[PDB]
């Protein structure tokens, strides 16, 4: 009686009456997403209906982790949780979970090819890095940052969409099979910043092996010390790839592409787009970089931080909804 149903494609969305005018806005493997107006809050929201949450243990563990993390992370530069509900009345009937989140206006896909100025560019990046820093402080390393999972509003505010784990934006540590740390996410910020500037994808590798080629062509074969850190097998390949000296950052990003600021933009990129993670700039040091630091505000850029049966997962998820 508190619920009503709307058909969205092949999907039936049964939601609380407060949510009105549902229309689909996209999908992932993790379910269909509708935009809706929350009458009670008087604002637009995203409603995500979870795809087969306890179909199996892999799905169940994913749904559970997503839910718990969403309840613990809270920051203006990360998509927040507004509500969680199920239309089923008991554990035995329990089938569906709905997640109500903040709605923005677009993802970055389009925004980044519409050339921006230094103020808007640096400000968006600043917001990205605050969101990232906050994720890291909650012990979350994203690893899959890309323009499709970064959303913006027409007032120039920006939010990271999800908690991550197109191959174009993944760090060398991930591409190859290395370990990783916090600044893995900085590689992605470099690729996105890079795109915004040159108008197109920095490393548009047509597969995982081509992806590598794209990088060394433009940045230059990494040092022999880096080469060591690799496995037996992949090191063989990487080390047997033809030496490239790569191009300087002046050639990779000339003045022609920019509207002193151009000079700093380039300097930041040269510190972000560095194959060897042990020499790549960090998140803190990037928030402090001259190009980004103009916007600083410690309330934004500093804010304080096993195995089950399907039947058990169902119970834990149901309790997390209640």
């Amino acid at each position: 009686n508190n619920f009503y149903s709307v058909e969205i494609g092949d999907s039936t969305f049964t939601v609380l009456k407060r949510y009105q005018n549902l229309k689909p806005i996209g999908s992932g493997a993790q379910g269909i997403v509708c935009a809706a107006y929350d009458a009670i809050l008087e604002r637009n929201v995203a409603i995500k209906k979870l795809s087969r949450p306890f179909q199996n243990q892999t799905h169940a563990k994913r749904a559970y982790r997503e839910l718990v993390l969403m309840k613990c992370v809270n920051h203006k530069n990360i998509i927040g949780l507004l509500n969680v509900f199920t239309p089923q009345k008991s554990l035995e009937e329990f089938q569906d979970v709905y997640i109500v989140m903040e709605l923005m206006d677009a993802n970055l896909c389009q925004v980044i090819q519409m050339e921006l100025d230094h103020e808007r560019m640096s400000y968006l990046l600043y917001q990205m890095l605050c969101g990232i820093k906050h994720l890291h402080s909650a012990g979350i390393i994203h690893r899959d940052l890309k323009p499709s999972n970064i959303v913006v509003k027409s007032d120039c505010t920006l939010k990271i969409l999800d908690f991550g784990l197109t191959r174009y934006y993944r760090a060398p540590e991930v591409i190859l099979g290395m370990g990783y740390k916090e600044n893995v996410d900085i590689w992605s910020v470099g690729c996105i910043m890079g795109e915004m500037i040159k108008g197109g994808v920095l490393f548009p590798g047509t597969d995982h092996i081509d992806q590598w080629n794209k990088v060394i062509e433009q940045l230059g074969t990494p040092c022999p010390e880096f080469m060591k850190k690799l496995q037996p097998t992949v090191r063989t390949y990487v080390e047997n790839r033809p030496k490239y000296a790569g191009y300087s950052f002046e050639k990779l990003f000339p003045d022609v592409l920019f509207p002193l600021k151009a000079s700093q933009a380039r300097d930041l990129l040269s510190k972000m787009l560095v194959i060897d993670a042990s020499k790549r700039i960090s998140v803190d040091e990037a928030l402090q970089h001259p190009y980004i630091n103009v916007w600083y505000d410690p309330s934004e850029a500093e804010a304080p931080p096993r195995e089950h049966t399907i039947e058990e997962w169902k119970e834990l998820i149901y309790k997390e909804v209640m």
Binding site: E119, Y123, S154, C156
Partner: peptide, 9 residues
């Protein structure tokens, strides 16, 4: 500088 309040969609 003032923070941008507009972004062309």
């Amino acid at each position: 500088p003032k923070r941008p309040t507009t972004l062309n969609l």
